[PDB]
Amino acid sequence: GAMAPSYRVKRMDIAKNDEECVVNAANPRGLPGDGVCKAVYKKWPESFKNSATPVGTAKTVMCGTYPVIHAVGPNFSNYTESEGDRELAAAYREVAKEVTRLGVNSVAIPLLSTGVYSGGKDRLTQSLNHLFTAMDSTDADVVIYCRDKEWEKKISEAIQMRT
Ligand SMILES: [Cl-]
Ligand SMILES: [Cl-]
Numbered sequence: 001g002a003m004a005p006s007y008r009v010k011r012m013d014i015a016k017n018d019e020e021c022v023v024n025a026a027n028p029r030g031l032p033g034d035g036v037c038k039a040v041y042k043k044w045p046e047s048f049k050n051s052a053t054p055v056g057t058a059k060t061v062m063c064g065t066y067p068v069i070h071a072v073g074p075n076f077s078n079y080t081e082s083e084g085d086r087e088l089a090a091a092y093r094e095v096a097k098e099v100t101r102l103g104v105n106s107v108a109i110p111l112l113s114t115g116v117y118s119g120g121k122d123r124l125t126q127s128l129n130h131l132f133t134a135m136d137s138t139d140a141d142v143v144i145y146c147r148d149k150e151w152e153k154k155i156s157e158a159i160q161m162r163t
Helices: 036-043 081-102 124-135 149-161
Strands: 007-011 022-025 058-063 066-071 106-110 141-146
Touching: 007 149, 022 036, 058 081, 066 081, 081 106, 081 124, 124 141, 124 149, 141 149
Parallel strands: 007 141, 022 066, 022 106, 106 141
Antiparallel strands: 058 066
């Protein structure tokens, strides 16, 4: 584990992360997709061999020795708010299990279901709180990646508020 497990946020491409493994914001079919998923496909395409997995689950595929944890958040276009919320929390709990199983000391993670799966809603707080629920009991250093300056500030504030 990390000597003093922390949360941090960076405003940059998660495909350029400085952590021991990455979480993909995957689609259920293991397709190259859009946004984070497409960046992950360009950087670690070998990790999309048999990466298909249902909504609410995580499946890790190694690119060389570098683990890519494919986490499938719900598309809120398809799900009700209530069921979407349930599957989003579940995806993060599976991420925590995989991070634990891999024995990594750090992980790069995007906010699941906040992009084209958001159903046109701002889900920063919803997604981040489910990330914290799952990851708080892990001892990996977590680095959250975002692209928007206002999101970086809001995520940073949320991390600092817990101390
Ligand atoms: Cl998304
Ligand atoms: Cl963002």
